Structures are given as C-alpha cells and as structure tokens.
C-alpha cells in the first residue's frame, strides 16, 4: 500500500513533465497545470511531509490564529511565526492603496471570514462578536446533528471583501463529509505554490480535520486536496529535484493530549506531533 | 484518445463498486464517494453526454436565465423549461416559511449571486443594477486584461443568503484559467446526483466556458468537474446499468452562429448543437 507522500511527489513529477510555462503576477515564471486532486489518508497517520521539514509550529500557530478570528499579523508574529508579517507592513499596505490602515491589519482575511462572514469589516481591533455568520461553529453543529448533510461548507472567498484584503485567500472553500463515523474534508485551493505553499497547506487542513473530528467524536477519514492553478515556480525546480531524490519516511501521528469541548478552547500545548524525523529543510525563494 | 464520456461513466462505475451506503432525507438512500475530479476536453467538441439524451434546451435556457440575474422561476418557465417551477410554488415557499413571497420568487439563487453578489436581496421583481459584485462581468474583464490571473472566481455560495434561498447552491464556485489562448474552467460542485443532475451540470459549465471563450477571443480549453458528495440514488442503480451497457457516440459540436461581444447579448437562437446522436432518454425519478 503506497506512502501518502507519493500523491504529492507524483504531482510535482506530473507538473515538471506536463506543466505548461505560464507567467505569473510576481514575474517569476511557473510550470502550470489547471485542475488537480489528491487524497491523503488521515487514518492513524498525520500527513506532515517527510522529504523535507515542514514548519509544523507555523501550521499549528497559524491555524489557532484563524480559529480565534484574528486579522492582526502582529498577533501571530508574537507566537514566533512570521509568515504574515510582510503582508501587514507599512510599505505593503501602501503598495495596495491602504494608506489609512494601521500596520498588521490584514483586512477581512481567513479568521474574519471563518467566524464573521458577511459582517462589515472595520479594523483588526473591532469587536465582531455575534455579527456575520460563524461558519466554523456552523460546520461543527451540522456535523453533531446531521452528519449526512451535503452542505457542510466553510468558504473564505468573499467577492465583497476582496478589495479590503491584504491577499485574496488561496484556500477558497472547504467541505466536510461524514460516513461510517469518519470525518473527511475536501479543500478547494485556487492557487498552489507546489514547492513552498502546498506541503504547509496539506498539514493545515489535515490539522483542521483532526480538530473537528476530535470535538465531534468522529475518527479522521481522508483529506482531499483539490487545486486550481497548481504551479512550480521556475526557481523551485532545483530545490524540488533534490527533494524528489529523498525517501519518504513514515508519517508522524498527531496526538491530542486532552478532551477539548469547543474548538475555541484548543491551545497549542494540546497537540503533540509524534515520530516526525523528516529529511532536512529545503528553502525555496518566496515569489 | 479515449472518449471524454468515459470519465463520467467510469465515475458511475467507481461509485457502484466503491461507494458506501449513506442516507438522505427522501429515504431513497444513495451510494456515495467523497471527492472526485474528471477532465472534459472542450477542444472542437462539446461534452453533451451521448449514452442518454441530455436536456440541452433546459441547459441553454437555464444558463441564459442565470446570466440575466433572474431569480423568478416564471421567467424560465415561459421559455418552456420548468425545472425551477416546484421550488417557486406557493406550497414550496410556505414549506420554507416564505409565506408572504410572490410565487416564482426563488430568493437569491444563482442569477442573483452571479450578477449581484452581496447586494441585500429584495425580491425577484427589483432592479439591482449598481448593487453587489457583478462576478460574471468581472471574470470576463479579468480574462481580457489579465489572463494570467489565478483569482478568476465566481462564487454562488453566500452563507449570508442561504437561509433565504429556495435551495442552497450545488455549484458553490467555479474558477477560470487561461494559458496559450485556451480558456479552462473548474467547477466545485458540492453535491452530485450522478444519474439525474451531473450530465446536465457538465453541459451547463461546458456551455458557459464556450460563451466566455467567445466574448474573449479564446479557444475553449478544458472543463474540470470537481465533486464533493458524488452519489447515486438507489432507484437509479438499475437505469444506470442500462446506461453503462451503451457505448458513447462522438460528442457533438457547439457552433455559435454570430459574433457576440457582451455575455448579456447571447440568445438561444445563437447556438446550434451539431451532430448530437444520443441513445434514448432514460427516465430517472427525482428524489
Ligand atoms: O496558503 C497559501 C497561500 C499562497 N500560496 C501561493 C499560491 C501562489 O503562488 C501565491 C498567491 O498568489 P496569487 O495566486 O494570488 O497570484 O502563493 C499557496 O500555495 N498557499
Ligand atoms: O444542479 C444540481 C442541483 C442539485 N443536484 C443534486 C445533488 C443532490 O442529490 C441534490 C441536492 O440536495 P442537497 O445536496 O442540497 O441535499 O440534487 C445536482 O446534482 N445538480
Ligand atoms: Cl513549510
């Protein structure tokens, strides 16, 4: 029975061989395929890639920051995870014509869309309690009451809010699915940087699934990752060919250390990755 | 190259062989698989299924009806297509608690979200011009000016609006992609009745791509159909095994009969399906 990591490595291989050359907004150049889908089993394994070290601290801390609805890069910055920092900087905000906005204000990105979809965004300090739709809690209650439901969706693509956003979300929607007591999740990702983004993104949605599984009493099933524009940046080709030579190692397991009742209650300390000794990190220049 | 239709038929097969029983509200039951993807080439052919007849005129009228932003079932019904009629009727509306709604008023469904995303829904009679995001035109404008864009999305899944819709959308979002003068489109369909609904859905989005390609000077590229809950109703199993007997006849072609430059300008008479040779319609009862 093949290693789950092979779905991912297979996709890189496919894009390297069949991707078509396609310029991008950043100017870097890509090899590009439109429309891909892979399936990672969450059953007694957590698919944290092993052919390079993935930023597990970043994934967990960033997901908790989404859960709490934060739209303040500094709030994540402070937990030791700098991934959003450039996007909240003075210069960049200015780049986009957001001169009035205070630094760190990312606008109505994921955390606001997850907890407050449709509320009038003001700034990153505002109290949004009980405004907009709480999609994350709705997904959880739907699972608890009607697992057969075919509309368990959370959606961060808000055409109305895109003008106000630092970055338009790559992870546009996700759907949950339950049969035989197993919770699955399919993410629609409109845009995937295969090198730097995608491994992080898989870990991030798998983690969401385990969290949701845990508070609804279900076992984690499958994470189905669907891609729009799946791309390898031209300058990721060499780092990736090195990656492609390494041997997958067993995926870690993910242990949740205490029974947790509300998704809001999860703390970073609740979670232990166990058995993860990946091949070394591989830097890939950000585009 | 294998017939495109085989993608669909092989999905039916997979669900028959591999799907798991899952209940729905009707008490029909389904076999179900979560997460599937098929690719239909649009180059010089049009995937209107041939192993049963597809309701092409329903497809074309319905798509033109969405493009106008209509949410009134009666406007479609006057074209000879009755697919939305039940959902707009006095008894149905009452069943949803829209006791005071004019009959035909579907609430903010596809047409409204496509043309007026995020406007406050009034009724099916209202003038909406100027309000909401005209996602369909924005997608068009973006294809002409910035074909490389990885953000060309139209979203019908509006959590704010769901409580007011006759039905929640099955097609939650679609993404467009351009490379080498070819326009592709991926649909994310959260829920697919494989027998009754999917061959229709496929024709629908293939048609839309053909329309947009036309007005932007592009060749049709690929249609990628992604599915969440891909299901066969138990009372379709037998009809489907009849269908699987049949061997696909070359897909017809779509000719568009005149130069049209605004998507609103398309009329049904503008389109000819040429060389469609389906086996007979197979009746499949609505769940
Ligand atoms: O979680 C994320 C965020 C971004 N990206 C990549 C995809 C693109 O390369 C780029 C976003 O830029 P656009 O697709 O918007 O051009 O970052 C990811 O892979 N994952
Ligand atoms: O364009 C459409 C609309 C509906 N359905 C099917 C999918 C489900 O069987 C049902 C919708 O019911 P829910 O998924 O909302 O329960 O209709 C389609 O296949 N295509
Ligand atoms: Cl990483």
UniProtKB/Swiss-Prot annotation, chains A, B:
It is found in: Nucleus; Cytoplasm; Mitochondrion; Mitochondrion matrix. It catalyses: dUMP + (6R)-5,10-methylene-5,6,7,8-tetrahydrofolate = 7,8-dihydrofolate + dTMP. It is an enzyme of class 2 (transferase). The active site is at 170 (nucleophile). Signal peptide: none annotated. PROSITE patterns: THYMIDYLATE_SYNTHASE. (6R)-5,10-methylene-5,6,7,8-tetrahydrofolate binds at residues 193, 287. Pfam families: Thymidylat_synt. Keywords: Cytoplasm, Disease variant, Dyskeratosis congenita, Isopeptide bond, Membrane, Methyltransferase, Mitochondrion, Mitochondrion inner membrane, Nucleotide biosynthesis, Nucleus, Phosphoprotein, Transferase, Ubl conjugation. It comes from the Eukaryota. Its EC number is 2.1.1.45. InterPro entries: Thymidate_synth/dCMP_Mease, Thymidate_synth/dCMP_Mease_dom, Thymidate_synth/dCMP_Mease_sf, Thymidylate_synthase, Thymidylate_synthase_AS. Pathway: Pyrimidine metabolism; dTTP biosynthesis. There is a cross-link at residues 262, 267, 283 (Glycyl lysine isopeptide (Lys-Gly) (interchain with G-Cter in SUMO2)). The modification Phosphoserine is found at residue 89. Homodimer. Belongs to the thymidylate synthase family. It is linked to Dyskeratosis congenita, digenic: A form of dyskeratosis congenita, a rare multisystem disorder caused by defective telomere maintenance. It is characterized by progressive bone marrow failure, and the clinical triad of reticulated skin hyperpigmentation, nail dystrophy, and mucosal leukoplakia. Common but variable features include premature graying, aplastic anemia, low platelets, osteoporosis, pulmonary fibrosis, and liver fibrosis among others. Early mortality is often associated with bone marrow failure, infections, fatal pulmonary complications, or malignancy. This is Thymidylate synthase. It comes from Homo sapiens. The gene is TYMS.
């Amino acid at each position: 029975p093949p290693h789950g990591e092979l779905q991912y490595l297979g996709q890189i291989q496919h894009i390297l061989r069949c991707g078509v050359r396609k310029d991008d907004r950043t100017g870097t150049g890509t090899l590009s395929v439109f429309g891909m889908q892979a399936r990672y089993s969450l059953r007694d394994e957590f698919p944290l890639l092993t052919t390079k070290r993935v930023f597990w601290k970043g994934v967990l801390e960033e997901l908790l920051w989404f859960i709490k609805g934060s739209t303040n890069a500094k709030e994540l910055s402070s937990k030791g995870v700098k991934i959003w920092d450039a996007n909240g900087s003075r210069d960049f905000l200015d780049s986009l014509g957001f001169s009035t906005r205070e630094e760190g204000d990312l606008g109505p990105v994921y955390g606001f869309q997850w907890r407050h979809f449709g509320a009038e965004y003001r700034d990153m300090e505002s109290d949004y309690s009980g405004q907009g739709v709480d999609q994350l809690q709705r997904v959880i209650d739907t699972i608890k009451t009607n697992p057969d439901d075919r509309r368990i969706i959370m959606c961060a693509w808000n055409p109305r809010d895109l003008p106000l956003m630092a970055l338009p979300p790559c992870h546009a929607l996700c759907q949950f699915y339950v049969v035989n007591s197993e919770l699955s999740c399919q993410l629609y990702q409109r845009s995937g940087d295969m090198g730097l983004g995608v491994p992080f993104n898989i870990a991030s949605y798998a983690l969401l699934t385990y969290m949701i599984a845990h508070i609804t009493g279900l076992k984690p099933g499958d994470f189905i990752h669907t891609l729009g524009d799946a791309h390898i940046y031209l300058n990721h080709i060499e780092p990736l060919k090195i990656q492609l030579q390494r041997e997958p190692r067993p995926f870690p397991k993910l242990r949740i250390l205490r029974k947790v009742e509300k998704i809001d209650d999860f703390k970073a300390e609740d979670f232990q990755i166990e058995g993860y000794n990946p091949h070394p990190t591989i830097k890939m220049e950000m585009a």
